[PDB]
Design a protein around this ligand. Structure first.
Ligand SMILES: [Zn+2]
Lengths: 97, 217, 245, 81, 62, 88, 52, 124, 102
């Protein structure tokens, strides 16, 4: 290929006429196209949140959890709300795992 | 040494024409009593030589702030006007430009107990012009950081792609706050430079020289 | 021997004969900046005036302006250089500016040198090839020099006179000192009656004299009042000064 | 009709962007102060210290940290505590 | 969070370098181009009535 | 006839050979023409206002380090460590 | 026509305007359409002489 | 490059009456303006490569320091929130209506040119 | 055919601007075709009057706006009145519009 001329034409026909709003039917469930975009938007965020979390899941969260724990962890380093505490427990867990 | 060639009627040429002609329209020239002809034309040209270039300054501050505010909405980027010295350093610099213009209207000498209260409310314009730009770019981005931490607490705890009606209602609340931030990015660059035309346009007044001798009838 | 070697170096290397040997490359650059520092030197300027004569026909317009106002300040008049200068102007008259032509004419007005082809191509360029508010940016002591250079040479261009009459106002004459404003107002009214052209902005060069008549004689105010009555019936009315307010 | 004349010159930067980038870089490198997390020491200390002990732990945070506060290096254990 | 910068003068001078480049770029590069095509159109639209009447009086072709 | 020496450098037709170079503005040619004819006569109020802010914020950066130096000396002349020992 | 000269502009070969048509915004009027056809007949200067 | 009307006047004066009407399409095309032909690609200029490597060198450097920022998962999930609106702007902005709305901001493109009305400049 | 070069240069140059202005005309071709219009436009930008037609619109000067446009295309008639002046000079006369009373 010519590196600027192939996939510019591929992205052009992915941008313009490649439409999963009609190729996947989807007018049966959705009223307009202005609300297909308004939840492909929120769908992009929920997919992108769930990919960013799962791509490195065993992590102690910087954000405040609201008193919730992921899975069978519940007292481990993943759920520990003191960070210097959980650094000690992660270093013990890393030798075992 | 060889300049580039411009297509006429380009979209950036049309946008910046309308932007410049907008900020120039905020401080319009005042109509003389006389008819404008070749007698009054040096008085009109000298009236333009004594007016500040607020049409150019306000579109300098429009285009440098809307470019900085909209950087904060590009991915991997933060707004430069979310910094305290950047955003308030543009606000003091507009206020000092208005004051240097108003001080030169005389001979650079600075103007009973009333005038410390006109001055205070005037010196607060300095910090209020920049802090309004700084706090808007900071408080919108900070709320987005807090609510993304809350909206990440649910898929971290619950399943990935599971219990999705809880995270859908907050991913659409996060999405509508980035959308409000696109509105605050454009409004605060407009409010900064609407107010720059108001503050600098206060001292944008000189005497029309005009005809001192006439041949009537 | 440190003082001896420096003094020997100073009498054979830094003189004005080698100062004019480095000045042979670009003449109108070195001609203009040296004359602005006060270096007249009448027979050092003859070395300029022959080193530049194979180049005058291909100079840029800011080079030609630099030659004439340098050869005006050094007061040296080379008649066969100054015909190559006016053949640069009258061949490239569309490229000259009113800022540049008002300085070339004031050189040609001191050294009483004119052509009819030059007087048309300066008037064609100020009127048509240049912005019509370029007289307003000129300063009225330069416009009065252009007005008399067209009245000395008897050249009536009524289109040029309507252009130069824009640059006379209270603004342009107010930037003059009253010694120089008087030398301009008398010089502009003497040229406006030589053509009999009384524009509507003659009431600012007349009113620059009648608002302060204590600097004028009664002979010169008779000259001024001759033009005032000549302009009053041309414009169709009577003169009246304005007290401001 | 002139459309193919404007496709010939491709991308081009704004016409003075090298003075903006050289002005923003010259404000970020001519700070006149040490480089944000470092401290100027004497030459006798720099020649005597290992490069693992010149490093501070605060200046090397972990690239994707599993616990908030993980650092990559540990620095000098000779604290003045 | 981050409130004061490491240097306030370095951030104020970054704002003055950015806004003076935009002032230079507008005055030198953008606004000459704006006015070359704004005022070709504006001079032609303002002169069009007096240009055509002056040209009507000039050409002897009628 | 009117014979093209009268139209020289006044009116040209659309080019047939090649598209010429764009004519530079005098400001695009030289920064000295921009600086002396437009930047300093017209925009010196802005350059004075940017100068005031860089000067004023260097006062406030000087007040902030003379207040850091005051609180630093008042811990090494008072037997305390002047910071929280990092954290690690 | 004007919209037909805008379609071959460099603006409409851009990515975001590639599948757009300038006639979709304001269409050419009936006089503009009939004068583009009349101007096409007269680009032959022999046809313009014999018509005149 | 002399002007093409004096080239038309000269090329029509030195033709004969017999080959006048045949020559009129080669005098028409000798005085047509140059519209330069669409050259070959030579794609991605020496400054379009600086603009895309320098933007990739910026996006990698900003994502590098975002990933060690103590709120690193919140920082990296804000780029997903910010790029979601860049996607929704490509799908919601009417780009032909926006193009013709900027053409009305400028008075040069909001109208047609107006001088020289053809009955004043005839030569009969 | 005495002054047909000037009248047909005006026709061919405006027809090419009008066909292409605001669509695809380069700025190099405008400054080629009309060099003294670009020269006078650049004088307003250089001398800080780049909003002079906005200034005359603010002060309602509709007749000084028509003079502003007419004086900037003023050089379109210069190839004629340099030709008609060099007719009348070689025919001994004076050019009419050069004179005050004439
Ligand atoms: Zn962020």
């Amino acid at each position: 290929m010519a590196v600027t001329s192939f996939l510019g034409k591929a992205f052009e026909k992915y941008f313009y006429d490649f439409s999963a709003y009609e190729q996947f039917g989807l007018n049966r469930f959705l009223s307009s196209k202005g609300q297909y975009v308004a939840l492909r938007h929120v769908g992009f965020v929920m997919v992108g949140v769930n990919v960013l979390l799962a791509a490195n899941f065993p992590f102690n969260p910087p954000f405040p959890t609201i008193g919730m724990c992921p899975a069978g962890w519940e007292g481990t380093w993943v759920c520990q709300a003191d960070k210097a505490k959980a650094l000690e427990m992660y270093k013990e867990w890393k030798k075992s795992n | 040494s060889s300049v580039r060639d411009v297509k006429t009627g380009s979209l950036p040429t049309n946008f910046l024409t309308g932007v410049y002609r907008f900020w120039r329209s905020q401080n319009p020239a005042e109509k003389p009593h006389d008819p404008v002809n070749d007698r009054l034309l040096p008085a009109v040209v000298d009236a333009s030589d004594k007016r500040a270039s607020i049409g150019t300054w306000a579109t300098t501050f429009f285009c440098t702030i809307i470019s900085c505010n909209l950087l904060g909405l590009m991915p991997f980027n933060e707004a430069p006007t979310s910094g305290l010295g950047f955003a308030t350093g543009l606000g003091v610099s507009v206020w000092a430009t208005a004051t240097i213009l108003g001080l030169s209207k005389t001979g650079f000498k600075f103007p009973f107990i009333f005038v410390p209260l006109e001055t205070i409310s005037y010196t607060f314009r300095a910090v209020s012009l920049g802090v309004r730009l700084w706090v808007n770019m900071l408080a919108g981005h900070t709320l987005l950081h807090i609510l993304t931490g809350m909206a990440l607490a649910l898929p971290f705890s619950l399943g990935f792609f599971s219990m999705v009606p809880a995270t859908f209602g907050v991913c659409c609340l996060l999405s509508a706050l980035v959308g409000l931030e696109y509105l605050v990015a454009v409004l605060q660059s407009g409010v900064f430079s609407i107010l720059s035309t108001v503050y600098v346009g206060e001292f944008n007044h000189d005497k029309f020289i005009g005809p001192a001798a006439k041949i009537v009838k | 021997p440190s003082q001896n070697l420096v003094s020997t170096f100073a009498n054979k290397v830094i003189v004005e004969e080698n100062l004019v040997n480095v000045a042979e490359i670009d003449v109108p650059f070195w001609s203009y900046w040296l004359s602005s520092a006060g270096f007249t030197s009448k027979d050092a300027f003859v070395k300029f005036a022959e080193a530049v004569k194979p180049k005058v026909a291909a100079l840029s317009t800011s080079d030609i302006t630099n030659l004439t106002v340098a050869f005006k300040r050094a007061n040296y008049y080379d008649k066969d250089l100054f015909t190559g200068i006016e053949a640069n102007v009258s061949a490239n008259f569309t490229k000259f500016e009113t800022e540049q032509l008002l300085q070339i004419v004031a050189t040609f007005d001191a050294f009483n040198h004119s052509s009819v082809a030059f007087l048309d191509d300066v008037a064609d360029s100020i009127t048509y090839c240049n912005h019509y508010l370029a007289p307003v940016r000129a300063g009225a002591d330069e416009l009065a020099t252009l007005l008399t250079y067209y009245a000395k040479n008897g050249h009536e261009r009524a289109d040029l006179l309507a252009t130069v009459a824009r640059g006379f106002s209270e603004v342009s004459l107010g930037k003059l000192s009253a010694a120089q404003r008087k030398d301009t107002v008398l010089s502009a009214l003497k040229a406006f009656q030589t053509f009999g052209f009384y524009p509507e902005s003659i009431e600012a060069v007349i009113g620059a004299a009648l608002v302060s008549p204590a600097e004028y004689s009664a002979e010169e105010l008779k000259e001024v009042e001759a033009v005032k009555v000549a302009a009053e019936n041309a414009l169709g009315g009577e003169f009246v000064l304005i007290q401001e307010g | 009709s002139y459309s193919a004349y404007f496709a010939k010159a491709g991308f081009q930067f704004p016409a003075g962007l090298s003075a903006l980038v050289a002005g923003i870089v010259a404000l970020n490198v001519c700070t006149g102060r040490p480089t944000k997390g470092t401290k100027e020491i004497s030459n006798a200390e720099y020649n005597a210290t290992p490069i693992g002990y010149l490093q501070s732990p605060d200046q090397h945070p972990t690239a994707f940290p599993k616990v908030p506060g993980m650092k990559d290096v540990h620095g000098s254990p000779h604290h003045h505590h | 969070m981050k409130l004061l910068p490491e240097s306030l003068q370095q951030e104020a001078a970054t704002a003055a370098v950015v806004a003076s480049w935009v002032l230079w770029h507008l005055d030198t590069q953008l606004l000459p181009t704006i006015m070359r095509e704004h005022k070709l159109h504006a001079c032609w639209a303002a002169a069009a009535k007096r240009y055509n009447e002056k040209l009507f009086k000039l050409n002897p072709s009628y | 006839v009117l014979g093209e020496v009268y139209l020289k450098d006044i009116l040209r037709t659309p080019p047939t050979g090649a598209i010429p170079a764009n004519v530079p503005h005098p400001f695009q040619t030289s920064f000295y023409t921009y600086a002396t004819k437009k930047l300093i006569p017209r925009h010196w109020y802005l350059l004075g206002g940017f100068t005031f802010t860089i000067t004023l914020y260097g006062i406030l950066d000087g007040l902030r380090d003379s207040g850091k130096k005051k609180a630093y000396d008042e811990a090494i002349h008072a037997g305390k460590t002047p910071y929280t020992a990092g954290g690690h | 026509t004007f919209a037909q000269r805008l379609n071959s502009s460099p603006a409409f070969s851009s990515f975001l305007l590639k599948r757009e048509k300038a006639e979709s915004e304001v269409p050419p009027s009936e006089l503009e359409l009939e004068a583009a056809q009349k101007a096409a007949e007269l680009e032959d200067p022999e046809v313009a002489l014999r018509t005149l | 490059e002399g002007n093409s009307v004096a080239g038309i006047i000269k090329s029509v004066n030195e033709t004969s009456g017999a080959n006048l009407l045949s020559s009129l399409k080669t005098i028409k095309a000798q005085a047509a303006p140059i519209y330069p032909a669409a050259a070959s690609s030579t794609g991605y200029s020496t400054q379009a490569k600086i603009a895309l490597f320098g933007a990739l060198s910026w996006i990698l450097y900003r994502a590098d320091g975002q990933s060690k920022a103590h709120e690193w998962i919140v920082d990296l999930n804000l780029n997903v929130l910010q790029a979601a609106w860049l996607i929704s702007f490509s799908s919601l902005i009417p780009f032909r209506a926006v193009y013709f709305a900027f053409r009305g901001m400028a008075p040069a493109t909001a109208s047609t040119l107006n001088g020289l009305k053809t009955f004043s400049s005839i030569s009969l | 055919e005495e002054e047909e070069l000037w009248l047909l240069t005006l026709t061919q140059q405006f027809k090419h601007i009008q066909k292409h202005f605001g669509i695809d005309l380069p700025h190099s071709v405008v400054a080629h075709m009309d060099p003294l219009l670009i020269k006078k436009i650049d004088w307003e930008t250089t001398n800080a009057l780049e909003d002079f037609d906005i200034t005359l619109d603010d002060m309602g000067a509709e007749d000084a706006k028509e003079q502003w446009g007419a004086e900037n295309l003023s050089h379109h008639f210069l190839p004629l009145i340099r030709y008609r002046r060099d007719l009348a000079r070689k025919n001994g006369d004076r050019y009419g519009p050069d004179l005050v009373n004439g």
